[PDB]
DNA sequence: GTCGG
DNA sequence: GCTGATGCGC
DNA sequence: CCGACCGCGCATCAGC
């Protein structure tokens, strides 16, 4: 909140590049910056100090030195005022809908909350749970409840299969005060990358959940991956609490720790390590870390038994999960 | 939109 | 049915 | 300049 001013402006003009002129590109440079001035530790004064951090270039630090002098940007303010821009910033909001689809019901005159209630029709199955849960998916959810929900998710899977694992990731893990879902890592030691000696070791785990009433819906669902809904039990005659977005990740056993790393998170943060590890030689994903060839492909999974193994390989010091939100 | 070679 | 591309979200 | 921009699971589609 230092430069929560610029950071907002930039986390903005993001969006817009995002959702309206689908250039991802433009997008990740946006949040870059955004990320690079939310850890700078001093107030900013002018585009030319912001220029000095490591992705601000000229295009922004010109934007910043109108945001500090008028307190707004005008390319935002007419940004604004365009109906098309507005609608489909909007419609991108209901978890399902990305740039494309909004676009699309942009076309159709679908353009409002009201508009996409009464044209379900047309809308796939997680698009349809998205809008149902519109409201409650944009409340924070406080630590307090998230540690309710982990005492749940934990003692039901435990219920299960004593041997399964259940790992509470994401904003969470790096002590957020507040979470914006529910990220869970899980394993067992019949799943790991030399065989699954088991089948639906996620199917049991989302069945149970759902037989206690803490999952309510599904948005998708593999055998290693469930993006879904959930929902604390509330007690007799209080408001019921919001319903959550929750996600599990079912990880081989023995790579645990690049699962559990790339779950931590941050997204910005995953995606500045992934990017240094190719410069270093090396390429990481939830499952492994692999060095690359003389031709830059991929070699064979490197030994770990931790977290700081991966950063020891890129030859970065260790950042406890808390020092990982960019 | 920003960067490094 | 399959495979491969595309959208979406993590 | 100008090529690079992290890497992947699931849903849905086109085309066979
Ligand atoms: C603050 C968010 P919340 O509290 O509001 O939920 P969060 O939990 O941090 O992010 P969630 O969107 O819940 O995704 C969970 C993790 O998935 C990883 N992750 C997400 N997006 C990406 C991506 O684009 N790339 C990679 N490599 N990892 C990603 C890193 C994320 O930490
Ligand atoms: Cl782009
Ligand atoms: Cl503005
Ligand atoms: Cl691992
Ligand atoms: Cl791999
Ligand atoms: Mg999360
Ligand atoms: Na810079
Ligand atoms: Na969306
Ligand atoms: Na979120
Ligand atoms: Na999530």
């Given at each position: 909140?230092?430069?929560?001013?610029?950071?907002?402006?930039?986390?903005?003009?993001?969006?817009?590049?995002?959702?309206?002129?689908?250039?991802?590109?433009?997008?990740?440079?946006?949040?870059?910056?955004?990320?690079?001035?939310?850890?700078?530790?001093?107030?900013?004064?002018?585009?030319?100090?912001?220029?000095?951090?490591?992705?601000?270039?000229?295009?922004?630090?010109?934007?910043?030195?109108?945001?500090?002098?008028?307190?707004?940007?005008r390319k935002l303010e007419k940004i604004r005022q365009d109906d098309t821009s507005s609608s489909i910033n909007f419609l991108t909001?209901?978890?399902?809908?990305?740039?494309?689809?909004?676009?699309?019901?942009?076309?159709?005159?679908?353009?409002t909350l009201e508009d996409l209630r009464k044209n379900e029709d047309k809308l796939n199955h997680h698009q349809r749970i998205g809008l149902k849960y519109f409201g409650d998916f944009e409340k924070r959810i406080?630590?307090?409840?998230?540690?309710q929900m982990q005492d749940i998710?934990?003692?039901?899977?435990?219920?299960?299969?004593?041997?399964?694992?259940?790992?509470?990731?994401?904003?969470?893990?790096?002590?957020?005060?507040?979470?914006?879902?529910?990220?869970?890592?899980?394993?067992?030691?019949?799943?790991?990358?030399?065989?699954?000696?088991?089948?639906?070791?996620?199917?049991?785990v989302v069945e149970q959940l759902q037989k206690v009433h803490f999952i309510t819906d599904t948005l998708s669902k593999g055998e290693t991956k469930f993006m879904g809904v959930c929902q604390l039990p509330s007690k007799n005659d209080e408001k019921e609490?919001?319903?959550?977005?929750?996600?599990?990740?079912?990880?081989?056993?023995?790579?645990?720790?690049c699962g559990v790393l790339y779950f931590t998170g941050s997204d910005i943060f995953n995606k500045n390590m992934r990017a240094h590890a190719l410069e270093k030689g090396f390429t990481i994903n939830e499952y492994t870390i692999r060095p690359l060839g003389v031709t830059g492909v991929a070699g064979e999974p490197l030994p770990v038994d931790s977290e700081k193994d991966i950063f020891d390989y890129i030859q970065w010091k260790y950042r406890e999960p808390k020092d990982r939100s960019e």
């Open positions: 909140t230092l430069n929560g001013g610029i950071t907002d402006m930039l986390t903005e003009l993001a969006n817009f590049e995002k959702n309206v002129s689908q250039a991802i590109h433009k997008y990740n440079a946006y949040r870059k910056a955004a990320s690079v001035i939310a850890k700078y530790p001093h107030k900013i004064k002018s585009g030319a100090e912001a220029k000095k951090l490591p992705g601000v270039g000229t295009k922004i630090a010109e934007k910043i030195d109108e945001f500090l002098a008028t307190g707004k940007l909001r209901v978890s399902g809908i990305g740039p494309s689809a909004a676009r699309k019901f942009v076309d159709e005159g679908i353009k406080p630590r307090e409840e998230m540690l998710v934990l003692n039901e899977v435990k219920k299960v299969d004593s041997e399964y694992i259940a790992t509470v990731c994401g904003s969470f893990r790096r002590g957020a005060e507040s979470s914006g879902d529910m990220d869970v890592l899980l394993t067992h030691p019949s799943f790991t990358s030399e065989s699954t000696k088991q089948p639906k070791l996620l199917h049991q609490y919001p319903h959550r977005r929750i996600d599990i990740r079912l990880i081989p056993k023995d790579q645990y720790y």
